[PDB]
């Protein structure tokens, strides 16, 4: 084949399999790019490490979580040798394998490379920035599943103080985190905060949506 | 809020949320985005519109498929008066109407709206396009959905019968379109033939696949 990189292409079509419910047809496509694009590009070439990312997402998708956490972990691997942290697909791929972790029940695992992730982007990226604040709440929820639920507070409170001083309270990313934050009390133990936060969040919507 | 057409950047945090089966959450999240846009943004906005179509799609990720094909119902009422059939916007928001009705049991909707996504995209987009190829092998399996087995085995075959005279044989887009057309074959109680087809296909995948 030509050029073997321009099946990029295929994961567009993987992604509309997949949210049609067609989860076993686009784990079949991309197992066909992955083995293409591993007969002719090498082993740390971005586009042959894209499309097993893809095929790993594929994969959980498809209830194959055991097969996607192995294939990450060889995409996290050899990324770590290749791209330095600060790389956007470098934090994808690690992002993905924490997620991966977790339907694994790998829970330890999937707190340390967020917190790599979250590291990172408090750097790279401003703190409205949906990807930063999406890798937040995913953390926190992580830390709550690995036990850890006094650092997911922790962590839910400075992003909430930061968004009281930047967004105002109708804010979307505002009432998430708050509704984020809830969650976290809650599990904590911190049943009345968590009632009095969600009791704000819900009069916040009901005035905004209300008709 | 100053400019609440940015409240774009919304959309990728819901994604966010619903990959990790968050899809309460997304909901919430957009049902805000579009209560404070309703009251800023013309009805014909794009921005607005754009909210509209990303809420419609959490609503269907939560179950909620009346309540997307309302909400889509309208979203592509207004489009069919502001946006020219080629407009790409336009059709996103009728492909995606077309997924909702199928969810809702609407199976000749569906048919009408894919049909003309796939008869606009027949002009605008190239024959290997990954969005054009979704969108035919999307209208096969709704005319079979339909009763209309026969056309889902007619449009297959011209598909498979012009990537055999543009693509390789390995190529995955190759290969899935034969797929398709084999479940079309064996929908129409051409049983033979597909499974021919099926062998053919297992076949190329494994000569390329197996180490």
């Known amino acids: 084949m030509e050029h073997p990189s321009r099946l990029r292409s295929q994961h567009e079509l993987a992604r509309r399999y997949q949210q049609n419910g067609q989860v076993q047809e686009a784990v079949e496509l991309l197992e066909q790019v992955v083995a293409i694009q591993a007969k002719t590009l090498r082993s740390e070439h971005p586009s042959r490490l894209a499309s097993q990312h893809e095929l790993?997402?594929?994969?959980?998708?498809?209830?194959?979580?055991?097969?996607?956490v192995e294939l990450l972990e060889q995409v996290v691997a050899i990324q770590a040798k290749t791209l330095r942290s600060e790389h956007p697909?470098?934090?994808?791929?690690q992002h993905e394998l924490a997620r991966?972790?977790?339907?694994?029940?790998q829970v330890q695992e999937a707190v340390e490379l967020l917190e790599q992730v979250v590291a990172i982007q408090a750097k790279t990226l401003r703190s409205e920035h949906p990807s930063r604040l999406a890798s937040q709440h995913e953390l926190a929820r992580a830390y709550q599943?690995?036990?850890?639920?006094?650092?997911?507070?922790?962590?839910?409170?400075?992003?909430?103080?930061?968004?009281a001083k930047t967004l105002r309270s109708e804010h979307p990313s505002r009432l998430a985190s708050q509704?984020?934050?809830?969650?976290?009390?809650?599990?904590?133990?911190?049943?009345?905060?968590a009632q009095e936060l969600l009791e704000q969040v819900r009069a916040i919507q009901a005035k905004t949506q209300r008709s």
């Open 179 to 193: 509704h984020e934050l809830a969650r976290a009390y809650q599990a904590n133990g911190q049943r009345q905060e």
């Open 89 to 93: 697909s470098r934090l994808a791929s």
């Open 145 to 163: 599943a690995n036990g850890q639920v006094q650092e997911a507070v922790e962590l839910l409170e400075q992003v909430v103080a930061i968004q």
């Open 56 to 68: 790993a997402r594929a994969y959980q998708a498809n209830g194959q979580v055991q097969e996607a």
């Open 100 to 105: 991966a972790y977790q339907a694994n029940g």
